[PDB]
CSV table of C-alpha atoms and ligand atoms in Angstrom, one decimal:
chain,number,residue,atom,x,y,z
A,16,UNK,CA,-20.2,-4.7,-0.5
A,17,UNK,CA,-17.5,-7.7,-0.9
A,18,UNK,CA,-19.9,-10.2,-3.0
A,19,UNK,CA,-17.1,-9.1,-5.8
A,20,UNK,CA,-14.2,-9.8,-4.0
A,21,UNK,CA,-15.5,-13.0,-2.3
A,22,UNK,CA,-16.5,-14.4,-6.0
A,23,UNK,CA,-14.9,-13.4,-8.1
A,24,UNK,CA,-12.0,-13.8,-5.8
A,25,UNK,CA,-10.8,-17.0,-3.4
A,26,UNK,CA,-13.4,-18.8,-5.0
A,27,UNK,CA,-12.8,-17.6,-8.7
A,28,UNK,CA,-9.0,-18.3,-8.8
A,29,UNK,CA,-9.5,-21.8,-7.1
A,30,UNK,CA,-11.6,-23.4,-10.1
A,31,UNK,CA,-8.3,-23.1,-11.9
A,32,UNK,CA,-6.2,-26.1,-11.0
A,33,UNK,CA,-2.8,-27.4,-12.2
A,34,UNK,CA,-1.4,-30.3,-9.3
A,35,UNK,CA,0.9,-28.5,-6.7
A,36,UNK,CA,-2.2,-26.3,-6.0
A,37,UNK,CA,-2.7,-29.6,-3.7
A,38,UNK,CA,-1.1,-27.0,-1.6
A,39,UNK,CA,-4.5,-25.4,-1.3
A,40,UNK,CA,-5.6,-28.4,0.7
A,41,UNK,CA,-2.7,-27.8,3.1
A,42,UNK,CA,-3.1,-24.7,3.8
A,43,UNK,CA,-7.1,-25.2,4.7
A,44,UNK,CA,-5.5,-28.2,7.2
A,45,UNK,CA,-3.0,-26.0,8.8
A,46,UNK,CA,-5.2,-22.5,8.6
A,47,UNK,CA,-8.0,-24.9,10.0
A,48,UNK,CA,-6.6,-27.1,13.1
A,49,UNK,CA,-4.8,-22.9,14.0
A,50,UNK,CA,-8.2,-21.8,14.0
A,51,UNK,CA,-9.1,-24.7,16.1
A,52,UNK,CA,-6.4,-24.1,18.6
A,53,UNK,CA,-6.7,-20.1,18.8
A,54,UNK,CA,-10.3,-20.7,19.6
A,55,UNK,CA,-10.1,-23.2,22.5
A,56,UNK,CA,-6.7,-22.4,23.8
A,57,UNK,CA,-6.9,-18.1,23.6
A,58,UNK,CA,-10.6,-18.2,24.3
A,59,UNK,CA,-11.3,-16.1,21.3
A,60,UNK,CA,-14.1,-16.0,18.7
A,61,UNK,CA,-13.9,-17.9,15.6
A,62,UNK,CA,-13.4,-15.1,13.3
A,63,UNK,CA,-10.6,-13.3,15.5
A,64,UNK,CA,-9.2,-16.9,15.6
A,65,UNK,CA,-9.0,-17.3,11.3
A,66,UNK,CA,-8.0,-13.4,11.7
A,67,UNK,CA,-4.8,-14.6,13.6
A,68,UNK,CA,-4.0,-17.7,11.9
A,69,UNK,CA,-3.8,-16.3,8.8
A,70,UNK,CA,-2.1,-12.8,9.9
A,71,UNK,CA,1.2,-14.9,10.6
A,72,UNK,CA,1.5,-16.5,7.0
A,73,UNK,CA,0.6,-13.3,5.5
A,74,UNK,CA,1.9,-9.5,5.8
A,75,UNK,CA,-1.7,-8.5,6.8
A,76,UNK,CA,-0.9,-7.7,10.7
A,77,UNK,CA,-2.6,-8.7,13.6
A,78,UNK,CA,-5.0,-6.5,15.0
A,79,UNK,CA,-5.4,-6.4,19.1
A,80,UNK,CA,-5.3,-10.3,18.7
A,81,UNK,CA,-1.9,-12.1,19.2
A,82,UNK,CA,-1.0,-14.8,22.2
A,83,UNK,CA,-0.7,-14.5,25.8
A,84,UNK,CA,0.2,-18.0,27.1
A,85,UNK,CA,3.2,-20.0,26.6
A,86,UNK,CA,1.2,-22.8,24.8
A,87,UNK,CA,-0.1,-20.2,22.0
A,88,UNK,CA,3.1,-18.5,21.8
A,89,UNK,CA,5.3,-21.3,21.1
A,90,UNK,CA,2.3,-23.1,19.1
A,91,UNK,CA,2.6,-20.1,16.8
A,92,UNK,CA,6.3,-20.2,16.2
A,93,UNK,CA,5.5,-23.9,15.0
A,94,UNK,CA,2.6,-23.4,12.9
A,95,UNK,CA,4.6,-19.9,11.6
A,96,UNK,CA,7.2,-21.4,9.8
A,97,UNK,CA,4.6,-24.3,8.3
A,98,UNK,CA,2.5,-22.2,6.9
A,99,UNK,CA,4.6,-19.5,5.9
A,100,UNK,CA,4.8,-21.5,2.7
A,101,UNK,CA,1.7,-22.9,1.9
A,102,UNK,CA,0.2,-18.7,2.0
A,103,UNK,CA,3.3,-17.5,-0.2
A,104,UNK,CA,2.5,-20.4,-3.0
A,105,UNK,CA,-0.9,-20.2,-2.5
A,106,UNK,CA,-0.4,-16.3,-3.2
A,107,UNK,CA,1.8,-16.7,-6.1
A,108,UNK,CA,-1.0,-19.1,-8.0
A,109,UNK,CA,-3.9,-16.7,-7.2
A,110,UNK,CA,-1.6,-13.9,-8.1
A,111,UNK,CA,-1.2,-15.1,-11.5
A,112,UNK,CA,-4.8,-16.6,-12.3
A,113,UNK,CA,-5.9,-13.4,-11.6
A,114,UNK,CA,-3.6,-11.7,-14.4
A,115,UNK,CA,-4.9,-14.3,-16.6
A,116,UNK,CA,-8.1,-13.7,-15.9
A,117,UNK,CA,-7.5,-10.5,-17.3
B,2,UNK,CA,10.9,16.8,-0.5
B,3,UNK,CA,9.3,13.5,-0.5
B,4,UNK,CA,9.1,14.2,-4.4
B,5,UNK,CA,13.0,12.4,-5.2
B,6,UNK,CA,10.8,9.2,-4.0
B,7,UNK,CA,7.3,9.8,-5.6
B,8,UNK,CA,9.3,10.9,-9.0
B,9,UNK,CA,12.5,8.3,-9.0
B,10,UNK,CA,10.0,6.0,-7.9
B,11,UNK,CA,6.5,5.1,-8.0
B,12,UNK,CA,6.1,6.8,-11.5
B,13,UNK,CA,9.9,6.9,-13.2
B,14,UNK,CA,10.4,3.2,-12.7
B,15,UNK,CA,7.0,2.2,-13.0
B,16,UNK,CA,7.2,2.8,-16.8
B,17,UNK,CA,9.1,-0.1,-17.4
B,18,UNK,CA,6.5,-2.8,-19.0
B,19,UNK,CA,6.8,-6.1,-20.5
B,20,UNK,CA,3.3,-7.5,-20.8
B,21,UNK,CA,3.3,-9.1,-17.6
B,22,UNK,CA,3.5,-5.8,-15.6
B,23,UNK,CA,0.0,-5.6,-16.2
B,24,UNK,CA,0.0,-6.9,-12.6
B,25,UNK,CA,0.4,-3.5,-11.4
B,26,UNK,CA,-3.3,-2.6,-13.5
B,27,UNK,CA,-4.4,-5.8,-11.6
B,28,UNK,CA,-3.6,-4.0,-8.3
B,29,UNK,CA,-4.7,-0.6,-8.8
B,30,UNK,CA,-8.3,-2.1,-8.8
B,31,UNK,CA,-7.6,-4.4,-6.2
B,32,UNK,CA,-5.9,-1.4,-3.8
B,33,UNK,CA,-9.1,0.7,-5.3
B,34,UNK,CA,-11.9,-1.5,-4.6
B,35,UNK,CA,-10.4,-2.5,-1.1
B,36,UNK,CA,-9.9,1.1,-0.3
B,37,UNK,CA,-13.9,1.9,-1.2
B,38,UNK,CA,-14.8,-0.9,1.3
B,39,UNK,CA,-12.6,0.4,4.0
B,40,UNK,CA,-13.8,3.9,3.4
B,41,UNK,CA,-17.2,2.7,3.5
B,42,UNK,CA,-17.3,-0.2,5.8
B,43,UNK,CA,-15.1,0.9,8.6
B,44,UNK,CA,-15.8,4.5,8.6
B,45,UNK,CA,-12.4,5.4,8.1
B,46,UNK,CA,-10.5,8.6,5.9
B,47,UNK,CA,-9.0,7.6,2.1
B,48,UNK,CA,-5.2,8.2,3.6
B,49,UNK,CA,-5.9,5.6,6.3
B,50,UNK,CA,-8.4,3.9,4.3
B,51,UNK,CA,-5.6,3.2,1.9
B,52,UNK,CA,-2.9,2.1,4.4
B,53,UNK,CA,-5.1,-0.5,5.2
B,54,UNK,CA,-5.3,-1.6,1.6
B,55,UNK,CA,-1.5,-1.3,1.1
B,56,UNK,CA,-0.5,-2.8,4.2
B,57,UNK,CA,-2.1,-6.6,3.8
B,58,UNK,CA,0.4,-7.8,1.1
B,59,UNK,CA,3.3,-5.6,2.6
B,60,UNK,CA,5.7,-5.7,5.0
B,61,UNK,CA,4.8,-2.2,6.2
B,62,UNK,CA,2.5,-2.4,9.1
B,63,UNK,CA,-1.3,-1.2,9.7
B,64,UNK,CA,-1.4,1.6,11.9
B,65,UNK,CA,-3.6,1.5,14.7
B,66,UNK,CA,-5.8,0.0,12.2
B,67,UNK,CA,-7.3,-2.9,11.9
B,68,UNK,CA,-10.5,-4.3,11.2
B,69,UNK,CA,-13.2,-4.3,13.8
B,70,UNK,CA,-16.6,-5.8,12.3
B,71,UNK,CA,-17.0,-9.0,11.3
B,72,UNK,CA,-17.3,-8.1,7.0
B,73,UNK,CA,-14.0,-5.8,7.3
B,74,UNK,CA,-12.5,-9.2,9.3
B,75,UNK,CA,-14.1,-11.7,6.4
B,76,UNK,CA,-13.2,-9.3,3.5
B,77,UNK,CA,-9.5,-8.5,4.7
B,78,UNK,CA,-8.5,-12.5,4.4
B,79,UNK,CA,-10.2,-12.8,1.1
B,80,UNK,CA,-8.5,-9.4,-0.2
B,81,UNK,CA,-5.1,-10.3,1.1
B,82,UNK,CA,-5.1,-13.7,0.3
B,83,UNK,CA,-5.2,-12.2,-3.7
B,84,UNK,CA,-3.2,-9.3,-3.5
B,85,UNK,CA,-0.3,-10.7,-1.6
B,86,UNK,CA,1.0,-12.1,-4.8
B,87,UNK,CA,0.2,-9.3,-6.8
B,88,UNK,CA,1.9,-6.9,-4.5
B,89,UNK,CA,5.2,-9.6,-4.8
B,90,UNK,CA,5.5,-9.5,-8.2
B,91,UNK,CA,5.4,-5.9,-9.1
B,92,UNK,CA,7.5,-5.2,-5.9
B,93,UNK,CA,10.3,-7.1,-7.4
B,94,UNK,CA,9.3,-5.7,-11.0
B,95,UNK,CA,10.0,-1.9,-9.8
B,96,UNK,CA,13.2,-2.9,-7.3
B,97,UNK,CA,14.3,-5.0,-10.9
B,98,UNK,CA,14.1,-1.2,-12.2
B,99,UNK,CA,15.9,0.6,-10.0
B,100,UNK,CA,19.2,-1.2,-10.5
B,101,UNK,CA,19.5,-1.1,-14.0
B,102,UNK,CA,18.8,2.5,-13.0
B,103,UNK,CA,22.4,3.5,-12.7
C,11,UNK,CA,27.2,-8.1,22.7
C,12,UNK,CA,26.1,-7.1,19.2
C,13,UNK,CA,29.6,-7.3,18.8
C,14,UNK,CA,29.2,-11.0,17.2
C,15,UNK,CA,26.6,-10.1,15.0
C,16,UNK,CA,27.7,-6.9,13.0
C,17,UNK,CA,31.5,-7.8,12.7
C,18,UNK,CA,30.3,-12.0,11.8
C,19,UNK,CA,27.0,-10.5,10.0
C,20,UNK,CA,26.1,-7.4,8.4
C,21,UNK,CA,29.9,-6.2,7.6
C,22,UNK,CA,30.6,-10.7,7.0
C,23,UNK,CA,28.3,-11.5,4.1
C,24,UNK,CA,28.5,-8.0,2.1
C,25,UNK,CA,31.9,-8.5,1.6
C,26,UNK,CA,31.0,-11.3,-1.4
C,27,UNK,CA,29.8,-9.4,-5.1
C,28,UNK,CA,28.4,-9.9,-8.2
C,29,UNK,CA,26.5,-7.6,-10.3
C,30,UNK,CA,22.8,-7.6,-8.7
C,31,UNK,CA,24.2,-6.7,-5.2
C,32,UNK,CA,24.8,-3.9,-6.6
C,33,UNK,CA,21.1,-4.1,-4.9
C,34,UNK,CA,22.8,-3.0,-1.6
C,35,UNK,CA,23.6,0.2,-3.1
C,36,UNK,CA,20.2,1.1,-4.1
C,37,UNK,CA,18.8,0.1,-0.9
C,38,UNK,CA,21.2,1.6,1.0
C,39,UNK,CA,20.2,5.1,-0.6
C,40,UNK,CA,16.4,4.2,-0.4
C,41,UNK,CA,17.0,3.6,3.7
C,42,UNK,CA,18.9,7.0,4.1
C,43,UNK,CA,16.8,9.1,2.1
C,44,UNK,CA,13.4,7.3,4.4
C,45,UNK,CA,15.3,7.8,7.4
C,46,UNK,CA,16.0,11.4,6.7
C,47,UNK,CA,12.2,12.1,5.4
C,48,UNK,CA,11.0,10.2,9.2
C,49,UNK,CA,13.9,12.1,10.9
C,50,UNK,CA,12.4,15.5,9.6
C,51,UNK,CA,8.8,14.7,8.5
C,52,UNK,CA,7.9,12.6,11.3
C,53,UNK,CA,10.0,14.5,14.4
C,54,UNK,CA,11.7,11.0,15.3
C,55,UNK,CA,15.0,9.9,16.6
C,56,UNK,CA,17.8,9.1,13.9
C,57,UNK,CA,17.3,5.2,15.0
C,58,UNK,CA,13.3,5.4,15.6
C,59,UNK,CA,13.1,6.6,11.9
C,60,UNK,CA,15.9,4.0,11.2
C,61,UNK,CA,14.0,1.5,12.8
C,62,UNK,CA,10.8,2.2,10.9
C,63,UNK,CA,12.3,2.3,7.6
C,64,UNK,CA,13.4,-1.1,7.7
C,65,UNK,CA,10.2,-2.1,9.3
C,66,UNK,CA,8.2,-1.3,6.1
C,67,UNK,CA,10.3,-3.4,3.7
C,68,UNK,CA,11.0,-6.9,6.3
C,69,UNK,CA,9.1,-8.6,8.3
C,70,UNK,CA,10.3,-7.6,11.7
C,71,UNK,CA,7.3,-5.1,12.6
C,72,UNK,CA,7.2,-1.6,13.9
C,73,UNK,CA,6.5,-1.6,17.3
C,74,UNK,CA,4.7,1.7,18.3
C,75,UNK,CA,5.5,3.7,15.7
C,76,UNK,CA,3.3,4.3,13.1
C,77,UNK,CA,3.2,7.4,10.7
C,78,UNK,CA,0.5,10.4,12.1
C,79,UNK,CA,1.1,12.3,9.0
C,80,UNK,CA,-1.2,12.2,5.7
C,81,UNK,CA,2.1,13.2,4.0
C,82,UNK,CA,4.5,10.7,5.8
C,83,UNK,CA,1.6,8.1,5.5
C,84,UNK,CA,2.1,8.8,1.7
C,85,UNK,CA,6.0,9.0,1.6
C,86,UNK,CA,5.6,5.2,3.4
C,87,UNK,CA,3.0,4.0,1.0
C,88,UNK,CA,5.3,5.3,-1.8
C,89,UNK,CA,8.4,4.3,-0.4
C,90,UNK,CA,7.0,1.1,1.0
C,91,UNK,CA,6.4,0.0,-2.7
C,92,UNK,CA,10.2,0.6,-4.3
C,93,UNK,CA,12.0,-0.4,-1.4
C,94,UNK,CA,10.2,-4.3,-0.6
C,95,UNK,CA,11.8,-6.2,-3.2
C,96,UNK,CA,15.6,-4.5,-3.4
C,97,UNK,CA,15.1,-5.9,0.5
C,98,UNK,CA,14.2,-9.3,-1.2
C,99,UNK,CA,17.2,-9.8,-3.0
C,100,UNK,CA,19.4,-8.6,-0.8
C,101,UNK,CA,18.1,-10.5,2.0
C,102,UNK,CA,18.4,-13.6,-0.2
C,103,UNK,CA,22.0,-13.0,-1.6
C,104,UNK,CA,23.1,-12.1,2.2
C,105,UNK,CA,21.0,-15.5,3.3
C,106,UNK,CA,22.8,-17.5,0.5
C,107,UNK,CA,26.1,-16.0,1.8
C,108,UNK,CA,25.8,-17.4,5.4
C,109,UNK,CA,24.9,-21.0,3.6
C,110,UNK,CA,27.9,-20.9,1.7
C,111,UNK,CA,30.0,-19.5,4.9
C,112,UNK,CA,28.8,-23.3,6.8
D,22,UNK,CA,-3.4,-30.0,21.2
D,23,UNK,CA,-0.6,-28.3,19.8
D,24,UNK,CA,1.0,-32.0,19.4
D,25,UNK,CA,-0.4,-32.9,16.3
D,26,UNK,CA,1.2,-29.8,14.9
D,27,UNK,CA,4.7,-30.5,16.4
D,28,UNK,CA,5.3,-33.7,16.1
D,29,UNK,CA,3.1,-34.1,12.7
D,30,UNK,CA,5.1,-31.0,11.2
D,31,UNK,CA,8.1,-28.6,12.6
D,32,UNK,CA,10.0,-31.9,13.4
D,33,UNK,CA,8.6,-34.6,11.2
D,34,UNK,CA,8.8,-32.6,8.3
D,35,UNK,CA,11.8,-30.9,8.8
D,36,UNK,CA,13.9,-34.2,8.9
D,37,UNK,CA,13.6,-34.1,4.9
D,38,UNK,CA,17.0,-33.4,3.8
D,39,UNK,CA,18.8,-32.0,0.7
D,40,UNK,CA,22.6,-30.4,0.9
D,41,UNK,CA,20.9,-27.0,0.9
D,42,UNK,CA,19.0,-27.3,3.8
D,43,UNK,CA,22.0,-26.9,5.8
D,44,UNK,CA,20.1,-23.5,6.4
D,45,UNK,CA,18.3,-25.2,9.6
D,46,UNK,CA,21.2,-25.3,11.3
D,47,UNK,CA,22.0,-21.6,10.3
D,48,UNK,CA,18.7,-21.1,11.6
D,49,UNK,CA,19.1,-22.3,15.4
D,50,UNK,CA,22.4,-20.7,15.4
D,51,UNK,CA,21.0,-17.2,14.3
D,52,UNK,CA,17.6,-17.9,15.9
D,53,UNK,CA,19.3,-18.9,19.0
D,54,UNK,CA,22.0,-16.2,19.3
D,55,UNK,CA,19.0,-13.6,19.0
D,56,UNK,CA,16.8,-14.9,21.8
D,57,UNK,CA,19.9,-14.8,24.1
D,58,UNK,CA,20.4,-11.4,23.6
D,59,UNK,CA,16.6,-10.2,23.4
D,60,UNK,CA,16.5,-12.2,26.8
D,61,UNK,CA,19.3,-10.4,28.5
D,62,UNK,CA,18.9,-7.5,27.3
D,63,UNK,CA,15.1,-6.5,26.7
D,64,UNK,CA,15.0,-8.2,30.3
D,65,UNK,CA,12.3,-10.4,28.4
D,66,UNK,CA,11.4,-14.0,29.5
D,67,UNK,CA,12.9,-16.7,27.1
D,68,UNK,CA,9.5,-17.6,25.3
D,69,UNK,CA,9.0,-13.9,24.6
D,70,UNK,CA,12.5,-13.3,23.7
D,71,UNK,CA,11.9,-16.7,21.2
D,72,UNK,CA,8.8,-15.0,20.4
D,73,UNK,CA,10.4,-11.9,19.3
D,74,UNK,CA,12.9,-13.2,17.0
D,75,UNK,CA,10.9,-15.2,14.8
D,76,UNK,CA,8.5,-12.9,14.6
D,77,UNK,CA,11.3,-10.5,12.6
D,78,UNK,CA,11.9,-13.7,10.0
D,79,UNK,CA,8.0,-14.6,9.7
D,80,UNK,CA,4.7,-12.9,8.9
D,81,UNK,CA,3.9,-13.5,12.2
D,82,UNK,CA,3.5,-9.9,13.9
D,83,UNK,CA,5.3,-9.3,17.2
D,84,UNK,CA,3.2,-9.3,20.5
D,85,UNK,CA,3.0,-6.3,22.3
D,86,UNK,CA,6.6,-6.5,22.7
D,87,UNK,CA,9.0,-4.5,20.6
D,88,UNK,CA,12.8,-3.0,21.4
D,89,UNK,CA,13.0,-0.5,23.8
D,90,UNK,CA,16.5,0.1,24.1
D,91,UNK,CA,18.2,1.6,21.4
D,92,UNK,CA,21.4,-1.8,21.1
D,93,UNK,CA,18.1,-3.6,21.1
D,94,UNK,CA,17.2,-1.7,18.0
D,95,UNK,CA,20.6,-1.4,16.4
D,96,UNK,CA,20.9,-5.2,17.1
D,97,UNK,CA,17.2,-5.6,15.4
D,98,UNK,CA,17.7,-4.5,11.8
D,99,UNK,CA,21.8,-6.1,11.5
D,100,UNK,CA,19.3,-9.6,12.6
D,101,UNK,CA,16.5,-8.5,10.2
D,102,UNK,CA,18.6,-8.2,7.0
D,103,UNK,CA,20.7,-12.0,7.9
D,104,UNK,CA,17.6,-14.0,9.4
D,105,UNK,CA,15.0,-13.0,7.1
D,106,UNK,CA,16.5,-15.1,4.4
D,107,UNK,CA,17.1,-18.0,6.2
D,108,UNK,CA,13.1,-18.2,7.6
D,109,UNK,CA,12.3,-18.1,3.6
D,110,UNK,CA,14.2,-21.0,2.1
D,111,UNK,CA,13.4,-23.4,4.8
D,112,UNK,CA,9.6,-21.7,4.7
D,113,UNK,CA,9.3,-23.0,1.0
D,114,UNK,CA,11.2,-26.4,2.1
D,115,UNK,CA,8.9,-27.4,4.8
D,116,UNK,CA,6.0,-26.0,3.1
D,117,UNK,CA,7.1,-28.0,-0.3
D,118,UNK,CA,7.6,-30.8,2.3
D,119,UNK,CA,4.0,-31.4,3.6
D,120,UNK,CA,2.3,-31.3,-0.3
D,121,UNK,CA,5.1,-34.1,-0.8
D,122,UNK,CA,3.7,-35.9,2.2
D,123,UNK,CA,-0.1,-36.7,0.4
E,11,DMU,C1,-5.9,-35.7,-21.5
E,11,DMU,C2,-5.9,-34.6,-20.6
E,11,DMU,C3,-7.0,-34.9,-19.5
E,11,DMU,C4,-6.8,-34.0,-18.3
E,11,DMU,C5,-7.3,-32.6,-18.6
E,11,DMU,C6,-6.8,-31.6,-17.5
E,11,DMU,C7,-7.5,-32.0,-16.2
E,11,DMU,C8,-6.4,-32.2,-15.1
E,11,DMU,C9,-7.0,-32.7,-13.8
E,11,DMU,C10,-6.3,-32.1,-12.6
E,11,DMU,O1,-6.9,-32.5,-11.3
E,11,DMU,C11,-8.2,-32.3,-11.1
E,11,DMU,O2,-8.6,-31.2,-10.3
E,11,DMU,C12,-9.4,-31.4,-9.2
E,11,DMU,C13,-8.6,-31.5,-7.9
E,11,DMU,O3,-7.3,-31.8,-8.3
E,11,DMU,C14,-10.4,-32.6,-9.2
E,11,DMU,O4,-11.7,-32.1,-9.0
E,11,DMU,C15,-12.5,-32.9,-8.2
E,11,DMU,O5,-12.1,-34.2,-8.2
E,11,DMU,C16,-13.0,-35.1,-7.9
E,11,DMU,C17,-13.8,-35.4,-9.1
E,11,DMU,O6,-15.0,-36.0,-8.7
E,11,DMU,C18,-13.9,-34.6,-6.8
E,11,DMU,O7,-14.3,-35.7,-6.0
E,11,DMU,C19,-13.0,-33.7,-5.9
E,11,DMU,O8,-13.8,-33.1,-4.9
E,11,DMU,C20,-12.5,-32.6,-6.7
E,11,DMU,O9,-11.2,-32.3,-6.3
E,11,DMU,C21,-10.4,-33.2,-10.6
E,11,DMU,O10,-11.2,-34.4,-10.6
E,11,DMU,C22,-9.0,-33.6,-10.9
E,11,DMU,O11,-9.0,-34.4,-12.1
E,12,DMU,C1,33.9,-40.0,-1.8
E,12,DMU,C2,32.8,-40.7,-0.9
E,12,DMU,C3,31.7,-39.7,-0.7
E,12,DMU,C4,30.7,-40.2,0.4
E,12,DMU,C5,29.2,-40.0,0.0
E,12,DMU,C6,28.6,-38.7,0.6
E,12,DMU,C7,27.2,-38.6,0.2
E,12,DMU,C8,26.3,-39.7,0.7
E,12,DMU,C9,24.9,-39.3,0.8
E,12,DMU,C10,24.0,-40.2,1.8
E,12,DMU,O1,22.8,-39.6,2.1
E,12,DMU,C11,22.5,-39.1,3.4
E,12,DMU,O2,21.3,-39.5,3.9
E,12,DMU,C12,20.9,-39.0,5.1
E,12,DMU,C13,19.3,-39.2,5.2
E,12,DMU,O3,18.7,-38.0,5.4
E,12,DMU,C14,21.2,-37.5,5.3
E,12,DMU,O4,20.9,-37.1,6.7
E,12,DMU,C15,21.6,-37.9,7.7
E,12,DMU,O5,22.7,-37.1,8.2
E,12,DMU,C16,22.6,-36.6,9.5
E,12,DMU,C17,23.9,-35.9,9.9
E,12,DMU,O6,24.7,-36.8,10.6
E,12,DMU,C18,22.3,-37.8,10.4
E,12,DMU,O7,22.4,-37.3,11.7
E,12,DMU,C19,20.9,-38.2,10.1
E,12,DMU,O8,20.7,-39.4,10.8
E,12,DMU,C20,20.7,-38.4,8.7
E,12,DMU,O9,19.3,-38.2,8.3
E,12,DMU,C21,22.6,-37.3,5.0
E,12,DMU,O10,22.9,-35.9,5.3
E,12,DMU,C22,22.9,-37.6,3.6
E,12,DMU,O11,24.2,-37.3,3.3
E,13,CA,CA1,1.6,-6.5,13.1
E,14,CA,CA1,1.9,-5.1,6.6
E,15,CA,CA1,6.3,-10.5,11.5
């Protein structure tokens, strides 16, 4: 029940392109090589691990899922503050294409 | 008594429009159709069901809830990667009010 | 040994004015009136509800608290909306005001 | 693993320096000053106590850990309001930092 959103959406809004929407890019490297990590170092699936990378950029909230080893924990506070950024731009460009979309 | 907050708030200073307050139309269908899908989806009551919706482009916190099937995982990114903008924007829009409010 | 931070913080960096902190004042009432609502409402301690009102509007995060009324779940979700961005500005002036204080 | 995100970010781009990115500095201080007290009291080891007080500048999402005592609570929201600032400037500067490195 999400073909709308998923459309005419975060693939909608991305066919609409000035330059420091490279930023898009960025955040697929950073959101990506998290995934990566949360997978192989917090033994969880790939879909809980692109739940958590993304729920510290965003204000969404992690569910059950957030870190239990140092490695995670720490690796977190790193990647938090990088992507942090990347989302809140990335946010701000969507936010807009979708009011003039409208 | 919550009615000083619903009344000076989320409808006295919510008629304040240039034309780029149409963000907040923007969001009612974005909140809406989320809340539908949560509803639907994960089982869950409007109330709740709408908490959810509120809470992934706000600093307010999901409850207990979160997400536990794999479409309600998928959609949530997609939906608060768009809203978290849109949320920003008229959240700023309606604090803007309140000052020039007294 | 909070000591350091409310006496070099929160009671430092007010103490600097122009017209829009006039934010503080607006927030400030927002804050109370939540606080009293959760006090009442929601059966919690004067800091608990303290806590949780300034958990809806920051990033910090609520801990175990949550709202388990459909009418305080409401008074967040209306409350939540007004009081995110007069906790924008105010965290940005105050942020400013320890740059300025270096 | 985490390597190629701390070296090839939270230290490599956040040796890019304006005047007002005096902020990191501001940062450790404020950062640091938190962890010591989350560590003594919240009895918390030092990661978790590091994990904990970012978590209340970023969209991160605390662990299961939280404030239990009530200083720990008092001491949480004076933080929140002085941090919270400081974790968005240097957010946008890193983040404006690693589109600038392509
Ligand atoms: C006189 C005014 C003329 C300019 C009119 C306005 C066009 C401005 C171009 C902005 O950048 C564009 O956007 C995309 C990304 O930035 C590129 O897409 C595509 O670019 C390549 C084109 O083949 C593909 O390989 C890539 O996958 C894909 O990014 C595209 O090419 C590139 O030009
Ligand atoms: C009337 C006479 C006035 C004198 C002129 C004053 C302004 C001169 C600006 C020179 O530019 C500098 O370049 C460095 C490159 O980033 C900066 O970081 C430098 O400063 C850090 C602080 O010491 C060093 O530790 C680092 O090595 C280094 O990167 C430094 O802050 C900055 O000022
Ligand atoms: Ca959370
Ligand atoms: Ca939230
Ligand atoms: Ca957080």
């Amino acid at each position: 029940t999400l073909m709308f959103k998923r459309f005419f959406g975060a693939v909608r809004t991305s066919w609409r392109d000035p330059s420091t929407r490279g930023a898009v890019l960025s955040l697929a490297i950073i959101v990506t090589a998290a995934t990566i990590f949360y997978t192989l170092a917090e033994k969880w699936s790939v879909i809980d691990s692109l739940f958590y990378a993304v729920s510290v950029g965003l204000p969404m909230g992690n569910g059950p899922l957030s870190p239990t080893l140092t490695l995670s924990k720490i690796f977190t506070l790193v990647y938090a503050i990088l992507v942090v950024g990347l989302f809140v731009t990335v946010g701000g460009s969507l936010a807009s294409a979708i009011v003039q979309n409208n």
